[PDB]
Structure formats: C-alpha cells, structure tokens
Design a protein around this motif. Structure first.
Motif, PDB file in Angstrom:
ATOM      1  N   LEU A   1       0.799  -1.218   0.000  1.00  0.00           N
ATOM      2  CA  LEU A   1       0.000   0.000   0.000  1.00  0.00           C
ATOM      3  C   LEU A   1       0.832   1.269   0.000  1.00  0.00           C
ATOM      4  O   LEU A   1       0.498   2.237  -0.673  1.00  0.00           O
ATOM      5  CB  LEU A   1      -0.918   0.019   1.223  1.00  0.00           C
ATOM      6  CG  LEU A   1      -2.161  -0.874   1.279  1.00  0.00           C
ATOM      7  CD1 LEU A   1      -1.914  -2.196   0.585  1.00  0.00           C
ATOM      8  CD2 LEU A   1      -2.546  -1.075   2.742  1.00  0.00           C
ATOM      9  N   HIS A   2       1.915   1.271   0.759  1.00  0.00           N
ATOM     10  CA  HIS A   2       2.749   2.457   0.843  1.00  0.00           C
ATOM     11  C   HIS A   2       4.160   2.136   1.293  1.00  0.00           C
ATOM     12  O   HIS A   2       4.360   1.307   2.176  1.00  0.00           O
ATOM     13  CB  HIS A   2       2.128   3.453   1.828  1.00  0.00           C
ATOM     14  CG  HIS A   2       3.035   4.589   2.201  1.00  0.00           C
ATOM     15  ND1 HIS A   2       3.219   5.694   1.395  1.00  0.00           N
ATOM     16  CD2 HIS A   2       3.824   4.779   3.286  1.00  0.00           C
ATOM     17  CE1 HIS A   2       4.082   6.515   1.969  1.00  0.00           C
ATOM     18  NE2 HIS A   2       4.463   5.984   3.117  1.00  0.00           N
TER      19      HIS A   2
ATOM     20  N   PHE B   1       9.713   2.607   6.852  1.00  0.00           N
ATOM     21  CA  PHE B   1       8.872   1.415   6.841  1.00  0.00           C
ATOM     22  C   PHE B   1       7.965   1.378   5.624  1.00  0.00           C
ATOM     23  O   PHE B   1       7.805   2.379   4.932  1.00  0.00           O
ATOM     24  CB  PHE B   1       8.037   1.306   8.130  1.00  0.00           C
ATOM     25  CG  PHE B   1       7.109   2.468   8.379  1.00  0.00           C
ATOM     26  CD1 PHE B   1       5.976   2.664   7.593  1.00  0.00           C
ATOM     27  CD2 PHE B   1       7.349   3.346   9.435  1.00  0.00           C
ATOM     28  CE1 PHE B   1       5.097   3.716   7.855  1.00  0.00           C
ATOM     29  CE2 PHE B   1       6.477   4.397   9.707  1.00  0.00           C
ATOM     30  CZ  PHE B   1       5.348   4.583   8.917  1.00  0.00           C
TER      31      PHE B   1
ATOM     32  N   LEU C   1       4.065  -0.240   4.220  1.00  0.00           N
ATOM     33  CA  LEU C   1       2.789  -0.813   4.647  1.00  0.00           C
ATOM     34  C   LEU C   1       2.368  -1.840   3.606  1.00  0.00           C
ATOM     35  O   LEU C   1       2.422  -1.573   2.411  1.00  0.00           O
ATOM     36  CB  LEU C   1       1.717   0.272   4.783  1.00  0.00           C
ATOM     37  CG  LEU C   1       0.310  -0.216   5.150  1.00  0.00           C
ATOM     38  CD1 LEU C   1       0.360  -0.995   6.448  1.00  0.00           C
ATOM     39  CD2 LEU C   1      -0.626   0.972   5.270  1.00  0.00           C
ATOM     40  N   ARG C   2       1.935  -3.006   4.069  1.00  0.00           N
ATOM     41  CA  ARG C   2       1.556  -4.095   3.183  1.00  0.00           C
ATOM     42  C   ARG C   2       0.273  -4.744   3.694  1.00  0.00           C
ATOM     43  O   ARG C   2       0.046  -4.787   4.898  1.00  0.00           O
ATOM     44  CB  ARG C   2       2.700  -5.115   3.181  1.00  0.00           C
ATOM     45  CG  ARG C   2       2.643  -6.212   2.148  1.00  0.00           C
ATOM     46  CD  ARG C   2       3.746  -7.222   2.435  1.00  0.00           C
ATOM     47  NE  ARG C   2       3.436  -8.051   3.600  1.00  0.00           N
ATOM     48  CZ  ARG C   2       4.270  -8.294   4.611  1.00  0.00           C
ATOM     49  NH1 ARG C   2       5.487  -7.768   4.624  1.00  0.00           N
ATOM     50  NH2 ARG C   2       3.885  -9.076   5.612  1.00  0.00           N
ATOM     51  N   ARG C   3      -0.568  -5.234   2.783  1.00  0.00           N
ATOM     52  CA  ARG C   3      -1.815  -5.911   3.162  1.00  0.00           C
ATOM     53  C   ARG C   3      -1.846  -7.314   2.576  1.00  0.00           C
ATOM     54  O   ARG C   3      -1.796  -7.481   1.359  1.00  0.00           O
ATOM     55  CB  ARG C   3      -3.049  -5.160   2.659  1.00  0.00           C
ATOM     56  CG  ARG C   3      -4.343  -5.896   2.998  1.00  0.00           C
ATOM     57  CD  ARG C   3      -5.537  -5.405   2.197  1.00  0.00           C
ATOM     58  NE  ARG C   3      -5.908  -4.035   2.524  1.00  0.00           N
ATOM     59  CZ  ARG C   3      -5.903  -3.039   1.646  1.00  0.00           C
ATOM     60  NH1 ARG C   3      -5.543  -3.265   0.387  1.00  0.00           N
ATOM     61  NH2 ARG C   3      -6.262  -1.818   2.025  1.00  0.00           N
TER      62      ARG C   3
ATOM     63  N   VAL D   1       0.409  -5.379   7.534  1.00  0.00           N
ATOM     64  CA  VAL D   1       1.707  -5.397   8.183  1.00  0.00           C
ATOM     65  C   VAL D   1       2.583  -4.186   7.867  1.00  0.00           C
ATOM     66  O   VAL D   1       2.639  -3.724   6.728  1.00  0.00           O
ATOM     67  CB  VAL D   1       2.486  -6.675   7.763  1.00  0.00           C
ATOM     68  CG1 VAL D   1       3.875  -6.689   8.390  1.00  0.00           C
ATOM     69  CG2 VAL D   1       1.702  -7.914   8.160  1.00  0.00           C
ATOM     70  N   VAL D   2       3.267  -3.681   8.888  1.00  0.00           N
ATOM     71  CA  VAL D   2       4.191  -2.572   8.725  1.00  0.00           C
ATOM     72  C   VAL D   2       5.612  -3.141   8.725  1.00  0.00           C
ATOM     73  O   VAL D   2       6.127  -3.554   9.771  1.00  0.00           O
ATOM     74  CB  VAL D   2       4.069  -1.569   9.876  1.00  0.00           C
ATOM     75  CG1 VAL D   2       5.125  -0.489   9.740  1.00  0.00           C
ATOM     76  CG2 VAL D   2       2.689  -0.963   9.880  1.00  0.00           C
TER      77      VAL D   2
END
Ligand SMILES: Nc1ncnc2c1ncn2C1O[C@H](COP(=O)(O)CP(=O)(O)O)[C@@H](O)[C@H]1O
Ligand SMILES: Nc1ncnc2c1ncn2C1O[C@H](COP(=O)(O)CP(=O)(O)O)[C@@H](O)[C@H]1O
Ligand SMILES: [Mn+2]
Ligand SMILES: [Mn+2]
Lengths: 187, 187
Positions: A9-10, A15, A17-19, A29-30
């Motif tokens: 996602l970002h 860090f 960001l993941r889904r 998850v970060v």
C-alpha cells in the motif's frame, strides 16, 4: 496458515505498509528495518540513558541508546557499537546479547536486539546516568515507558541481581526483520 | 517542535497511517487504538500465558492475554477484564496497574496498559501456566519476545521479589492513544 496474496500500500522512509490475505483473513503489516539498543553498564552498575522527543507521543521519553538497521549489510552489533559511540560517547570492550523484543507483533515485523555493553571507555571529542536499581524502579513507576528501554533495563536488572545471564553475540536473532531492507527502495 | 501539516495516507482496519511535517522534518506515524494486557497471578505465583500465531513473524509467540481498545467508550480495565475472561477463562477480584509501555515510539502512537489481576476465580464453560520466576527466565532466554509480555512478566517479577509495587487503577495512562479512535472511521 498461508499468505494468499501480498499487496504493498505504501513505502515510506523507514517502513512500508503491506496488506496480506491469510490461511481467509486480512492482515496489514508494517515492514520495518529493525533496530538495536544498548544497555551500557559501567564498573559501578550504572547505565546511560538519553532523553529524546518522540513525535508519536508529542513529548520526550527516557530511552536506551538505539539506532535503526538502516545500514545495508552492516552487522547489528557494529551498528550498535556506532550508536553507543555517537549517542553517549562510549566504547565497550565486551558485547553480549541481553534481550530481543518484538515491539508490536500485532501489526509490524519490527524486532529490536538489545545488547549489554561492558568494559566501558569514554571516547571522542541530552542524557543521564542511572543506577540500574533506580532505572528499574523508574520503569515500575512509569517514568520509563519506551518498550525497548523497559525490556533492557529490567533484563539487566535480572542479571545484576544474579537471577539471569547475558548471552553470546552469535545468539540467534529469530525475528530480525528482512522484508523492508529486501525492497531496497533507495537510490 | 510543531506540526506544520498532517496528511492521512491510509486508514486501515486497526490503524491509520499519517505523514506530518515538524518543528522541518518528515514524521510518518501509525495511529493505533491502543491495547490492554493482563498479568493474572494466582495464589501460588503462577500466571497464564497464551501461544498465538503472529503473521508479522510467521510463527507462534508466547504472550499475555491482551486486546485492542476497539470498544469505543469502554473503560480500559473493563476491556482488560473481558479479554482475561475470554482468553483464559478467569475472573479477578483485584485489579492494579502493573506497567504501561509504548511499543514502537519511533513510528506509532500505540501504548499498552498492562494490568496485574489477582484474587483469581476460574469462570465460564491454546495456553499454559508459568511460575513467574520461570516466565522471567524464559524472557532472558529469548523464549518470550513479545514486548508487552516481556514488560509484564519482568515487572510482576520485580513485584514478586519485593523490589517494586503495583499501582492504583486510576494511575494516569499518559500516552493512551486517541487519534485513530477519534477518526471513528466506521459505520
Ligand atoms: N494487522 C492487522 N491488520 C488487519 N486486521 C488486524 C490486524 N491485526 C489484528 N487485526 C484484527 O483486529 C481484530 C482482533 O484482533 P486480535 O484479537 O488478533 C488482536 P490481539 O490479540 O493481537 O491484540 C480481528 O477482527 C482482526 O481483524
Ligand atoms: N516515523 C518516521 N517517519 C519518517 N522518518 C523517520 C521516522 N522516524 C525516524 N525517521 C528518520 O530516520 C532517520 C534516523 O532516525 P532516528 O535516529 O530518530 C531513530 P531512532 O533513535 O528513533 O531509532 C532520520 O533521518 C529520520 O528520517
Ligand atoms: Mn537513535
Ligand atoms: Mn487477543
């Protein structure tokens, strides 16, 4: 369980960001670099602590000297030795593993290795020195809340009381993060 | 310092990602609900711990019964009493504040209040029971890494050894999160 699909996602500065979909369930998850902190205990049982402003809380917190594993390919304890030097100007002859902690297992893969540095030497050329017992009482009094700090202070306190023992530098760091660093989203 | 501008990048299920400019510096923050964990000590000095799978690490970790403060307007210790019941089927007559911890002060506003529940009663109708001393040795042996767990286990260990004291329920929880909950991004 099993990851059915990962979606980024970002990607930020420190860090990403993941889904992911699992086992079905959604898990965001970060991805973090991971970090290292140091509990430098001197010949008299004192350790140095820094007072740093934490934007996340909008105030200053008492913490152990620490740094992100943002130095690609650099051994963790090397990173730790550098931070100890730059943060409180100290060099240590003996390094052991005190405690590893997974900060927020609920949504991030960040893990922090806390070292116990001894055989201190003042080198170079805000922070304070605390007797371990006091640092510990400060934790139990809520004056030290940083999770990394709490873990390190109370761990070395178990060691100073003879309850537990430090560990070798080659001690396996099970949850050391790798995802974010594997992205190598820099140039 | 001062926030010059806040920009919301992503709102998820349990947290929101935000990017702020400060003092100038960029600070990306992960807004969290906040959580509560419980160290339920029985008449013989044992505490219950659960073995839960953590996708962030891809394995199971040993932790204290805990829950997110996702129940809008519900008092933290009420949330804690509910989780203790649902997680290990225990009711406690006495509740005190053991330790507050800020999990990853570097990028999230998450803070967790760990309670010390005593005067245990088995109610209702995976997990295990550990003597505090053992749980503590497990921490120092790396078998317990969850930051919340480490903080709670070692804190109650300082109390069981007479080193420190628990605290009143009205003890101020300085860093209790409010940002994400204030969004109320649900319907
Ligand atoms: N990283 C994540 N991303 C999306 N949802 C999450 C999440 N972590 C937990 N949740 C969730 O939030 C709710 C309760 O989660 P847990 O009871 O597993 C939390 P806890 O024991 O980890 O504090 C579940 O309905 C599930 O959606
Ligand atoms: N939440 C955040 N968002 C964006 N950048 C961050 C950040 N937290 C830390 N950084 C940064 O990462 C680099 C080093 O940060 P710190 O030395 O303050 C970390 P530490 O003492 O908090 O472990 C700085 O250049 C700064 O960009
Ligand atoms: Mn630092
Ligand atoms: Mn839970």
């Amino acid at each position: 369980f099993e990851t059915i699909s990962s979606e980024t996602l970002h990607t930020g500065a420190i860090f990403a960001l993941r889904r992911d979909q699992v086992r079905i369930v959604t898990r965001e998850v970060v991805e973090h670099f991971g970090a290292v902190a140091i509990v430098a205990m001197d010949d008299n049982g004192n350790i140095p602590m820094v007072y740093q402003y934490r934007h996340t809380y909008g105030r200053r917190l008492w913490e152990l000297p620490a740094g992100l594993l943002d130095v690609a390919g650099e051994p963790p304890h090397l990173t730790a030795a550098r931070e100890l030097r730059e943060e409180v100007g100290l060099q240590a002859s003996t390094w052991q593993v005190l405690v590893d902690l997974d900060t927020a297992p609920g949504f991030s893969d960040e893990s922090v290795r806390v070292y116990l540095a001894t055989g201190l030497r003042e080198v170079g050329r805000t922070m304070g020195w605390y007797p371990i017992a006091e640092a510990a009482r400060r934790v139990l009094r809520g004056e030290i809340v940083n999770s990394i700090a709490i873990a390190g202070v109370l761990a070395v306190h178990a060691v100073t009381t003879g309850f537990a023992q430090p560990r070798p530098l080659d001690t396996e760091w099970i949850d050391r993060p790798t995802a974010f660093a594997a992205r190598r989203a820099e140039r």
